[PDB]
Amino acid sequence: MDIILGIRVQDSVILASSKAVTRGISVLKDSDDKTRQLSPHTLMSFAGEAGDTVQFAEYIQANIQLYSIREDYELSPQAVSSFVRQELAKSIRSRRPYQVNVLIGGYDKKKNKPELYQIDYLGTKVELPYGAHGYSGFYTFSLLDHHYRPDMTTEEGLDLLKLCVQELEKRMPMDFKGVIVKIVDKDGIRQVDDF
C-alpha cells in the first residue's frame, strides 16, 4: 500500500493505484489490485495499514451490495461516500481504529456527472476534481494545478495521469511497481490493461 490517485474529467472518473505489496526488505507481490467495486457505477481505492485496508474495503462492499439487493436500486456516489465517511468517523474513536485512506470514484446516473471523493482515516471527506493519498499528493497536486482543465476528455485524462506516474517514478524513493488504472463512467467500470 502506498500510491493511490484519482482524476475527475468531463464524463468520467479515473483511478490509479500502485501494484506493489512490500513487507520488510522484500516485495512480496507486484500485481496487487488495491480497489473494490462497491456498485456497478461506484469504485473505491484504498491504502494504509496492512490487513485493515482489505478488511475495511470488503466490509463496505458487503454493506453496499446488501443495500442494492434490499431496495433493488443503486445508491448515488454522494450517498455511498457519506456512508463510508460515517463508518470511518465512528472508527477513529474505537478501541482499535481502521487506519485506511480511500478514494471513491463514481458516476451519478441521475445527474449524468462524474464524482470523485477523498476520505482519510479520520473521516475527512472532500469532493475534488483531482485527489491523492499519502506522499503522492506532494508531487501530483502541484502538477495537476498546472495541467488540469475541467472540460478534458477521458483520453486527455489518461495522458494527464501518465504525466503523474512518470513524475512519481522519477522522484519517489520506493519502487511501487507501476499502477492499475480503472475508468468509471456512464457505462460502468472497466480496467485499462496496457499502462
Binding site: 431496495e71 454522494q78 450517498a79 457519506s82 456512508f83
Partner: protein, 244 residues
C-alpha cells in the same frame, strides 16, 4: 407462578389468525375516518375528528395529521398515544438515514421499518400490539408521490386512494367510483371532502370537525411543500366546494 395471568398475546388461533391483531383492527374500525388520495401533481390527506366539543381549542390542536419530515406525513386512525410512540420513532429513523447518506429517506424505506416494528410485537415479547393504522403520504425522487397504509399486523400496501378507520367499506366504494388516474390535486381535495361528507356519522360536516393537509409541488420550481390547513382555511375550502 405468573403463568396463571399471561394472556399470550402472540399466538395463533386454530384457524391460523392472530387474536390480538384481529381485535386491534376491530378497535381501529371505531376511530374517526381518515382518507388519502394521490393525484398526478400532489397528494391529499383528509381526516374526521372524533365527536368534537364546542369548548375544544381547535386551532392549536393536533389529533389526526402528523408531520414526519419535510417530504412525508401521516394520517392516524386508532389510539393517539400509541401513534405518537411510533411517530417519534419514525421521525428519528428519517434523521438517521439523512445523517448516514446525506439524502432524504425514501418513503417505502421509512414505511417498511415502521411496519417491521409492529410485526415484532405480534411474533415476540409477549406485549400487546399497537392499536394504530397509518396512511403515509410522501414524496421522493425515485417513485414521486406515494400513498401507503400499515396496520397492527405490520403488513403494508401501496394505494392510489385509500381510507382507514370507520366506514372504510362505504368510503372505499365511493372512492373507487369517482377516482381516475389523470386527476389533479384540486379535484382530489373535492373528492376527499365529498366522501367524508357522505360516510360521516355526524349530522353535517363542518370546519371544526376536520383536519386537512396537502403535499403539492406548488412551491417555486421543482420542490415540495407541505400545507397543514388552518381552521379558517378549511372553512373557506368547505364553502368553495359547496358543502356549507
Amino acid at each position: 407462578g405468573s403463568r396463571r395471568y399471561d394472556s399470550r398475546t402472540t399466538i395463533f388461533s386454530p384457524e391460523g389468525r392472530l387474536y390480538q391483531v384481529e381485535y386491534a383492527l376491530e378497535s381501529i374500525s371505531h376511530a374517526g375516518t381518515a382518507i388519502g388520495i394521490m393525484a398526478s401533481d400532489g397528494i391529499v390527506l383528509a381526516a374526521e375528528r372524533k365527536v368534537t366539543s364546542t369548548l375544544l381549542e381547535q386551532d392549536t390542536s393536533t389529533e389526526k395529521l402528523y408531520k414526519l419530515n419535510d417530504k412525508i406525513a401521516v394520517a392516524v386512525a386508532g389510539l393517539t398515544a400509541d401513534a405518537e410512540i411510533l411517530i417519534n420513532t419514525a421521525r428519528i429513523h428519517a434523521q438517521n438515514y439523512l445523517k448516514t447518506y446525506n439524502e432524504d429517506i425514501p418513503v417505502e424505506i421509512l414505511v417498511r421499518r415502521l411496519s417491521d416494528i409492529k410485526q415484532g410485537y405480534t411474533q415476540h415479547g409477549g406485549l400487546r400490539p399497537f392499536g394504530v393504522s397509518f396512511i403515509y403520504a410522501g414524496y421522493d425522487d425515485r417513485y414521486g408521490y406515494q400513498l401507503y397504509t400499515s396496520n397492527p399486523s405490520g403488513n403494508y400496501t401501496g394505494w392510489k386512494a385509500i381510507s382507514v378507520g370507520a366506514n372504510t367499506s362505504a368510503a372505499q366504494t365511493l372512492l373507487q367510483m369517482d377516482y381516475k388516474d389523470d386527476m389533479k390535486v384540486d379535484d382530489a381535495i373535492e373528492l376527499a371532502l365529498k366522501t367524508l361528507s357522505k360516510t360521516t356519522d355526524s349530522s353535517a360536516l363542518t370546519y371544526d370537525r376536520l383536519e386537512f393537509a396537502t403535499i403539492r409541488k406548488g412551491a417555486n420550481d421543482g420542490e415540495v411543500y407541505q400545507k397543514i390547513f388552518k381552521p379558517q382555511e378549511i372553512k373557506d375550502i368547505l364553502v368553495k366546494t359547496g358543502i356549507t
